[PDB]
């Protein structure tokens, strides 16, 4: 249903 | 603060232990301690700042969507439903402000690399963006608009300054087309700027960074899925 | 305390909510503001009780694990591995105490039904078991021997008044035999308890309950793991 | 490695 936004991705 | 007497190096050395031990209340206690030093954060330091914070919200966020829809499917019984989804969202609105504060006193600069003014002014938007999932009435237009014009400005640096692969610029263009979508109601806004997203980083593919390329694929993709799903 | 104004009613609502939006600690409080009323609880209010904290004290308890290899690894640097460690352990201790003040202050009772008493001797025992995992010297010896009390009383009511697949009987013989091997340095005693309450569990398997029998086949497999694992 | 406890399972 709702929209993904930018992961708690470690960089 | 409560990190006032603790050395800058201290705090960033336990912000990293907290991330291991999976305590990101403590790990944002921790750089919020780091950024009141009031020196600047490397991209390392933003990282552990971005990755605590969003945590915690994170939680808030997941346990609000929760009770919120409890509520609505009793709205078809007591107080008790409305008053525990209250005290869930004064904390995520406190947590809001929290990061607002830290970026408005500190982070936010004139100067600074493209990098860093572009990854404060895209969590500014974030974070207005998760007090206008919970907000109403005339604290709420306010909201949408500081978010729509953090994201703006962001974006304005961003296509000027970065090769259109950078991963902040990528994450950002997703997070304003979500803003787009979900807070804004405005599907067209969202499905033009991860289109045009999406394809100007497919024709420079050629600019992905060795040390970043798996982020930049990474958010391509979820670009692609939000499309799939807006379709 | 802060629950003090609110219906018990309301708290026992209140703590199932949280339960449903994964908030453990405001679950935790919410319970020991229903227990602070002064009625006995339920089966079904000892689940919510039992549930929260055993949440808190988890995440504390994994982060401690954490912290505690990195600290012995750098014991092979500065103070802040140990300092954020015991900082960890303090907070723990701290959860602990409120468990045991709680067990002490309100709910072990010489009257009450079996299902009760065992219940909470077995919470007392637990809950001194994780003391005893952070702990050192004259604290500590007072501690273990308080967690073998608690669960010689529990098992010694369990053995008398319940079947041998009562799911509390079973989880206090697997909890007491976690004591042996891991806190009391005895495998033998470990190893004797545990095969003990599978083989009799087994040979009584008609005993089974209706409401609770897939809670007892779940303890039964975890006693049959620990023994395939102490082989 | 750890001997497994009761799990936190809702009853
Ligand atoms: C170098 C720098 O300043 N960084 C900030 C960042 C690297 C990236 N952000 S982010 O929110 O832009 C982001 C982009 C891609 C992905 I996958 C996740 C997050 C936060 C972390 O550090
Ligand atoms: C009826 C009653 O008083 N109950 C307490 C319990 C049901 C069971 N405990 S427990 O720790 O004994 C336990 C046994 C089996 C399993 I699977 C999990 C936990 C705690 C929850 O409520
Ligand atoms: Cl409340
Ligand atoms: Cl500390
Ligand atoms: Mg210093
Ligand atoms: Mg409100
Ligand atoms: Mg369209
Ligand atoms: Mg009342
Ligand atoms: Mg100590
Ligand atoms: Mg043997």
């Known amino acids: ?11 | 603060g409560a990190m006032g007497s603790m050395e800058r190096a201290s705090l960033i050395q336990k912000a990293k232990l907290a991330e291991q031990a999976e305590r990101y209340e403590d790990m944002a206690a921790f750089m919020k301690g780091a950024v009141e030093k009031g020196e600047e954060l490397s991209c390392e330091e933003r990282n552990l700042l971005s990755v605590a914070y969003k945590n915690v919200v994170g939680g808030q966020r997941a346990a609000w969507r929760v009770l919120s829809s409890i509520e609505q499917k009793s709205n078809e019984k007591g107080p008790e439903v409305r008053e525990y989804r209250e005290k869930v969202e004064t904390e995520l609105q406190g947590v809001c402000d929290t990061v607002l504060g830290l970026l408005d006193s500190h982070l936010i600069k004139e100067a600074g690399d493209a990098e860093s003014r572009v990854f404060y002014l895209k969590m500014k938007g974030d974070y207005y963006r998760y007090l206008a999932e919970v907000a109403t009435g005339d604290d709420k237009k306010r909201i949408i608009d500081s978010a729509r014009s953090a994201y703006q400005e962001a974006m304005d640096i961003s296509k000027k300054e970065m090769p259109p692969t950078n991963p902040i610029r990528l994450g950002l263009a997703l997070n304003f087309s979500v803003f787009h979508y979900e807070i804004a109601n405005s599907p067209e806004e969202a499905i033009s700027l991860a289109k045009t997203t999406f394809d100007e980083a497919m024709a420079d593919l050629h600019t992905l960074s060795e040390d970043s390329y798996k982020d930049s694929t990474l958010i391509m993709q979820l670009l692609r899925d939000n499309l799939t799903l807006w379709t």
Do not use: D
Not at chain 1, 1 to 11: A, E, F, L
């Open chain 1, 1 to 11: 249903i709702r929209s993904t936004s930018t992961p708690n991705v470690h960089m």
